Design a protein around this ligand. Structure first.
Ligand SMILES: CCCS(=O)(=O)Nc1ccc(F)c(C(=O)c2c[nH]c3ncc(-c4ccc(Cl)cc4)cc23)c1F
Length: 288
């Protein structure tokens, strides 16, 4: 092949990651290399392996090989020991997150995406980026993944992260990923699940026809809040690219006023958490 093949019997499978909520992904050991890995079990494999071999960057999970022994198929990668971003954020351990940490992580994600959009030898538009597709390696670095679940041609309850054009099956550019990245950032700031408890269909409807967007707290510093508005524009062409996001993050890092602003916001979760809850109460009733 043009990609590394790993034999099914050279893997020892442990748990299904996340009790099943992240699909048919397992933690395992690659026995001949004495290495811990993740495996995603598949029922078929198209020409994914060929693209995965040529994608490699410090903010994307590392491809190691493919299981190809019909009827068994799967993709084997790096296992990120600290798990999903979604899980971390929605746990109380994320209370340690300050300004710098949110800066570093928002940067990790933007650089991975910029790579996939513009620097990799082939152009990859994720189209399903969300905090349940970002994982955390033992060193603390974020790693995007699931960028080959589409098989690189549109296939063969995650409405909160989808741009409206994606929701309504319209032409998608790079900027669909900018919108989703917005949601991710908003998660890191609020440490809430976006549209928690709403229905999929209600989210879709609201986002597309009402231009409903996640509640940004009034204490949230301006810089960040504007970034969020920019990533969330219903006119996709207006949204920034990942290189511009990276450039905006950089001038944020040099604003000496922002640390204080962000950290007191982060530390006053006591206050603003029913700004968010109020809206959700209102939206749940709009359907009841
Ligand atoms: C190279 C990219 C190939 S792809 O086909 O686009 N994507 C692709 C292919 C194979 C995969 F295993 C995965 C994957 O899911 C993970 C990769 N590394 C991980 N480390 C930790 C966790 C984790 C651990 C614990 C919890 Cl509770 C949650 C997640 C999940 C994964 C994947 F996204």
């Amino acid at each position: 092949a043009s990609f590394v093949q790993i034999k099914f019997d050279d893997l020892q499978f442990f748990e299904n990651c996340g009790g099943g909520s992240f699909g048919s992904v397992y933690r395992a050991k690659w026995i001949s290399q004495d290495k811990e890995v993740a495996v995603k079990k598949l029922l078929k494999i198209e020409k994914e392996a060929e693209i995965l071999s040529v994608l490699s960057h410090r903010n994307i999970i590392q491809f190691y090989g493919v299981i190809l022994e019909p009827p068994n198929y799967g993709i084997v990668t790096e296992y990120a020991s600290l798990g999903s971003l979604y899980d971390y954020i929605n746990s109380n351990r994320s209370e340690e997150m300050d300004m710098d940490h949110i800066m570093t992580w928002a940067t990790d994600v933007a650089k991975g995406m910029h790579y996939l959009h513009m620097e990799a030898p082939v152009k990859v538009i994720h189209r399903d980026l969300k905090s349940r597709n970002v994982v955390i390696a033992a060193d603390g670095v974020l790693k995007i993944c699931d960028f080959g679940a589409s098989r690189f041609h549109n296939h063969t309850g995650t409405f909160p992260w989808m741009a409206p054009e994606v929701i309504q099956s319209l032409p998608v550019s790079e900027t669909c990923d900018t919108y989703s990245y917005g949601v991710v950032l908003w998660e890191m700031l609020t440490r809430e699940v976006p549209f928690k408890g709403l229905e999929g269909l209600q989210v879709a409807w609201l986002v597309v026809e009402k231009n409903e967007r996640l509640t940004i707290p009034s204490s949230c510093p301006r810089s960040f809040a504007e970034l969020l508005h920019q990533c969330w524009e219903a006119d996709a062409k207006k949204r920034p690219s990942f290189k511009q996001i990276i450039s905006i993050l950089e001038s944020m890092s040099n604003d000496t006023s922002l640390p204080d602003k962000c950290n007191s916001f982060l530390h006053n979760k006591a206050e603003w958490r029913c700004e968010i809850e109020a809206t959700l109460e209102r939206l749940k009733k709009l359907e009841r």
